[model samples]
Target: SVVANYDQMMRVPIQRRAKVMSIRGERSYNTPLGKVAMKNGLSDKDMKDVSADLVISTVTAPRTDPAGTGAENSNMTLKILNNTGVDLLINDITVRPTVIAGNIKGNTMSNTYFSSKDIKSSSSKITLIDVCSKFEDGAAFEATMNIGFTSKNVIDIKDEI
Candidate 1:
């Protein structure tokens, strides 16, 4: 069973004409089956449930301004934390924009600035995404991001069978 979990939309609060705008959204939950399977040395057929602890962290705009060339851009940092009690590598992070209304135009950036990041047990890592586009006055926007992790320990149930 290739179980997958998705975090809800992370709404970022941005104020018009603000020098810098940012927000942080967090999630912490446990997959009961995953915990039980971990104790039993779960088979390869069912292990992704363990990823329930790959908690994503707050997103902050370290720099929000118009580019030197007259292009508007913002540097957003997304932090991912590991609570799975084991080290793992980040496979991918999908950033999707839910809404870009109210005069916000141009290509909304969702670049995977960071990849193959290592997250140690009980530790965390950060991913930076540069949003280079145009934002009209009083523009409103929304987005969500999902993360995938590569576990260091993958048991093969088929090998035993």
Candidate 2:
């Protein structure tokens, strides 16, 4: 099987093999003399052929909501998905919003901030500070939210050493 061959071929140390470069659209390497490979691999593969199970369960777009009963405060929510079947802790996260194109400018955009939270398996969302404002006549806005998270977790093999 191609997969079985690739499994062994991938295990070979890079230093133990000759350099291979894609010379054409051909795939299987049936005939080879010594130095180089005869055929290039097919690049038409997809993620479905790579790994099973979707990495993310779901990801919702950013939305606007009222922060309080008052008119000034508002909330910009970003929904994240974690379907890794394990709990993920996110902290020291920085979030920001960009006004793509609307009835407002940079000053009317929401202010970015740092955050701390846990993204449970199959669930999530983080909030950013924002406030409602008014334009001259036709008041409307559209923006995108971005976030960066820093964490320290031991997901690899380790021991007392």
Candidate 3:
């Protein structure tokens, strides 16, 4: 049974912009089948119930803006497509800092949660953002996707700008 797959991502060049928490309630209900599964349901073919797509599109911009805020009209974050051909439930958005060299460094910027609908395929557009602050010279910025995924699995989206 394919329940679902997911990943947690950062789109603002943030550090540890994310973590995971899973919970449940109504703690006293269990059927015989549930017990059987828990005790003897081990199978060689059954594995993880979810698949995660950890892809990244990145962007970089100058905060100094000697040219001004409106100087550039380009998108500041990453741009990606729902190549899965299926709708994805983006759980949340996070940001981490690092460059294309693949050096994991820095901290988180911001993020938000969602219990709503998934973005439509083909017509949907994904974008990342830079929320850190003004940089005198410039800084690398990048983003990734996996909104409601788990913490045990971390995929490689792209690198920072």
* Clashes in predicted model 1: 0
The best-first sequence of candidates by TM-score reads 1, 2, 3
Clashing pairs in 2: none
Write model 3 residue lDDT over 29-102, tens digit each, in one string. 22221210111111222211212222323332222222332211212232233334444445554333445576
**C-alpha RMSD values across all candidates:** 11.0, 19.4, 18.3
lDDT by residue (1-161, candidate 2, tens digit) is: 11111001201111001111111221222211111121212121221132322121111122443344233233332233333444444332221223334533223433333234565544232222232322222333332222233223334543546
Minimal lDDT window, size 10, model 3: 33-42
TM-score of each: 0.44, 0.32, 0.29
lDDT of 1 by residue, 29-79 (tens): 345212211111122222234455544433443453444522233334444
Error of 1 at 115 (Å): 4.0
Worst 10 residues of 2 by lDDT: 10-19
Each model's lDDT = 0.39, 0.26, 0.29
Clashes of 3: 10
Model 3 misplaced stretches (Cα beyond 4 Å)? 1-55, 58-75, 96-104, 107-117, 123-161
What is the number of backbone collisions in each predicted candidate, taken in the order shown?
0, 0, 10
